Symmetry: D2
Subunit: 372 residues, 4 copies
């Protein structure tokens, strides 16, 4: 497997797995990494929905940042300042639960710019992204104010770009030759959307969550990579949740996109490559889902799991698995020398500072050796 | 290793690893599981701070629920209704970021009771736990309102019990023979606390985060299990973070508890068993940290990592590793599922419902075969 | 998933994964564990071919013990004295390379009985099992003779039971109500066989390796569990190995059982449950292999990977994954307490014993503490 | 951690983990990878002893190839023809049990040259490496003869270079600027040796197994990297193996190098970097072992575990962990075409070949589609 090796002292070229941080991205290439493929139910094997997209022009984007996905994003060896633009398909915990971990952890990892978040409105103010993010920053006010004593506060801002959820395939983002468009989903209540990213002749579709709809098959047509939800079978719903037969039937017809519906949709879209996600991807679940899709779609298909990677080029759409560090650390990139604001008041009182324990004796041995 | 096997068709007794869901808890026993042992930066090897404590009287408590920890909590095969009481040392993201995943995922997993959260006040209303959780629920208003429409919303409430962070070893919880006391920490700004859990002649101390302070050595004295922050070394801060020598010195003398200070503290405490946590536990960091602790503390010691487990009995405190499923699922408990008493409004518009795709033909084959 | 929990202090019953050592085996039950499922190319995800069979009468068998499989067998928490009977399908390294790891490691562990090995003859003496094991013990003569100075020699023996590879469905083992039958395979050259284990109304078939043959479909009919080789697709052979189209075609037609041929064979066998193995079980290979099988076979089907487990009961054949310790240890069982044979010569010469380094002062501190 | 990133579309330089196949090797550099660090009992966390050494001149060597280690070696993305020179410290199963996997697997992975094996004699013919390997090839005669039928048998040759185990620090290999010397060990019986590899001003010492001896401290002096056996403690032999206090004592004095002895030895050697190996490296074993070393040795130290890597340069010896594929595949390098010009007889009889099942119909659909 992989490219042929030419030198004992050289590299293995065109490697059969993707080692994040090890590959230069070509000017006419896209890398997409599944940083979470799961559900609102937690599991180490699958974080909740998250996608990292890297373009050959140097721009990078996150599409969804569900609970648990930051451990996968942090394994990519990408400096924090390169991942400041986030797009949310909807305001479920499994699609933005880890925004707070990017916000706080990225600020500790030396991010010098504010985060920038694009997400949908709702039917009223308190159902949309601007309200959600305002209240998320209030929720973590203790952490904001205590960090801002010691670290310049500018990177702790989150600038929200709210867009109209109702718009049919309209632009929500345009910069540097990169466009994102949105169109609606049918999921739980008004607000959720799908995105299409367009850049340099490519189109990548991030379906988010939806029951089958008339918008995705039209607006996604001809995508280089098209992602859509694909549910566990009704039989598996009965096995794994002890659901009554008629509810397990409804889950796959009314609430979610069945494997067979996913296949009809992708047969309509005719992407270069389709991606099913948002199912538990296990030895006893994945084959009947794949069979369901294959009833109606014969084209190239990935059954997503965490750390699956797609390389999109003019000639190919290649699936690999990423092999990345579980013992991850932040990596440094370019940044400003951002100086703490001396004008900000201490968040300690003297009552707390008066409690310090004298540890001079126990630290003297290492302190002497380290200072010399 | 482990207990001696006596039968080919029997079990392996007193097993050398802990399989969660496989062991009964005796009435004079405590199990503590580290579900997160890391830092504000994410990595699959170590979730952020989180502890599950199981008492022989059937009561279970979570102390801290940092980002990434719910994937470890869900691996324990514990019904969601047994995990409704949560204690927060402080409002850092690495100590309660996954409360939202417990709230929404626990509800998906069949919790029927509200969550109950105990956490500190701050120096002002907006720096305290009540404000924090109130605004976390506003931040997730779209998810709450869309989940709630046709069910009893009861499991989606969070009842907060805020206590004065300044109180010196005062009772913040007293129920069914169990007490928790808090006392202050010195960490980032006013508000953080440590807990002591007392039950059935046992005392378990959850230090949270602190620079060395006069309170923990007094109020933790004689604990069966004493958990405290223990930082990476100044040499490691220079190696891993490229900190200047002076700042790397300060980190272990002013901001955090050095390994040497941790040893001093645990020599003062004389616990049955000490636990160091809140460092990256890697092959090139753990040994220099352990050495620093052993300068001043000779007693029983655990260098925590994720899914480490302590069994506390009258005669021993035993450290094991848990071996748990990465491909986790929720488990059902005694279900007390209550019908809604009240109509709520749909969060759909006809504009969105008008978008449903006809997928009848694609689903006809599985639908017919499944209905028979 | 799994059975309903009824107590906070109790167990999770009928668990959705198999924790080895945690479940009693019923008197009318079989457990089969795949301890290796791969190929002669090594990989941590898949040890070479190996199966552990546990019957409700207390008998346990290994069927094949390919390179890399002992790490999986050791993870089961089965005492060495319970796993002394080994059946080999054929003498490829990927079916008995880890016989030496079983031999040496169990001897150090406290195994007190010799290993017993059943395997096929070949077309001449040097192509059969008796010859193979005779020469393997001579190959490891250094390790045999040295270990036999300090550990009783009895468990260091290997007793071989060589059976005629040409026999059609003849008994090769019959003891305590368990029968093994063999029949021929078509694989590389003469000698390889398949096995059927019959006990207490159950039939388990271990196919070993073969191109499609007239014997398996007749002699395997109505097995409770039927295991057969199932190959990667010709398109996969071209992607992964850069084989030209003509050689890639011949691999699935002449040398190995294609997924489509597996499906035909299992359609003829009508087992309660079929197991496909001996292919690399990866995100970009597994789906098309399952697809191939489903062209011709619609019954219950497992796509094997390491540590998959089947429970065979009168009512069901259930697939689960095992969740088992990577940091494995031997578990003690019933064993004799045998002195070393003091009549055997030391294998040290005085030339070597003259080189001992005086380390008394370096070891005196711990030696004293440990003395008391 | 790691080098500073300079470009969004570039690499992360000087990475904090080693991704095998991703780094060029400099002409004044060595890489050593621990491909096995464990014991004669198996566990997925630790293969038995094995080391891969890569020199900046393009030469590569394997030192020991214990059971389980080939899954690690195959994860390095090294072509099989670059790994044909193997050095054995001794003929324990935990040091050469996977030679047969390298022989068979490396042949299916495309090796075109014979293996070349250097190993010690013993005190008589049947206790030496030449005897051992000749008998190993007989043991696997069925696999050899069936593989060889239509192909050049050249890669299936093993050329043995047996050296006198008694020699004190004499040359056993000298080619292309690389020298290996051997000297004796005191381990189980006569035969075991240690190696020193010298190249380009570097010295790397592979201790193999030994009780403390007068040879290693003299001949390993000033090594860049010195590897030596470092045993589990006597208290651990009692806890983990249920050994009586008197035997637990003897194991760390008579039979093995204690952690304290290891520290004495490395204090004598004064290497640039010491490596302790051959202990189970677990959360409850590693710290007491490390403490025992530090009684006597203060210098740079690694506590080996599998896939630990050292980069030896003029300015540093750097420890990292390797992050490599579990789902490993062979990689191609620069190859022969080979061509046999001696005949070999078929190993099939017509009795076996007449057993072929007709599967034409079941294979017709895929076969037609494919040929187009
Ligand atoms: Zn979702
Ligand atoms: Zn913290
Ligand atoms: Zn095979
Ligand atoms: Zn050894």
């Amino acid at each position: 497997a992989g490219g042929k090796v030419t030198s004992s002292t050289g590299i293995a070229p065109k490697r059969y797995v993707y080692y994040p941080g090890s590959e230069e991205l070509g000017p006419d290439e896209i890398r997409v990494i599944a940083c979470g493929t799961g559900m609102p139910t937690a599991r180490r094997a699958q974080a909740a929905a998250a996608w990292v997209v890297e373009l050959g022009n140097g721009d990078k984007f996150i599409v969804d940042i569900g609970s648990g996905s930051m451990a996968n994003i942090q394994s990519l060896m990408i400096p924090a300042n390169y991942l400041t633009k986030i797009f949310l398909t909807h305001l479920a915990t499994d699609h933005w639960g880890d925004l707070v971990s990017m916000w706080a952890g990225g600020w500790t990892a030396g991010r010098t710019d504010p985060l920038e978040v694009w997400g949908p409105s709702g039917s009223r103010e308190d159902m949309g992204t601007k309200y959600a993010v305002e209240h998320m920053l209030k929720a973590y006010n203790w952490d904001y104010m205590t960090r801002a004593v010691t670290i310049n506060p500018r990177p702790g801002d989150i600038n929200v770009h709210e867009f109209d959820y109702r718009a049919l395939n309209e632009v929500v983002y345009q910069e540097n030759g990169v466009t994102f468009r949105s169109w609606p989903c049918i999921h739980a209540g008004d607000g959720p959307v799908s995105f299409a990213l367009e850049w340099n002749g490519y189109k990548v579709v991030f379906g988010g969550d939806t029951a089958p709809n008339i918008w995705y098959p039209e607006y996604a047509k001809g995508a280089d990579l098209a992602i859509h939800e694909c549910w566990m079978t009704s039989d598996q719903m009965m096995t794994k949740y002890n659901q009554p037969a008629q509810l397990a039937l409804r889950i796959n017809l009314d609430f979610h996109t069945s494997a067979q519906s996913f296949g009809q949709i992708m047969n309509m879209v005719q992407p270069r490559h389709a991606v099913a996600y948002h199912f538990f991807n296990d030895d006893d679940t994945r084959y009947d889902i794949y069979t369901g899709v294959r009833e109606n779609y014969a084209g190239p298909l990935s059954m997503a799991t965490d750390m699956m990677v797609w390389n999109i080029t003019r000639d190919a759409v290649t699936e690999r698995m990423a092999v990345s560090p579980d013992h991850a650390w932040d990596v440094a990139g370019p940044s400003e020398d951002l100086a703490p604001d001396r004008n900000r008041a201490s968040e300690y009182t003297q009552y707390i500072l008066d409690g310090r324990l004298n540890v001079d004796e126990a630290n003297a041995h290492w302190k002497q050796e380290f200072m010399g």
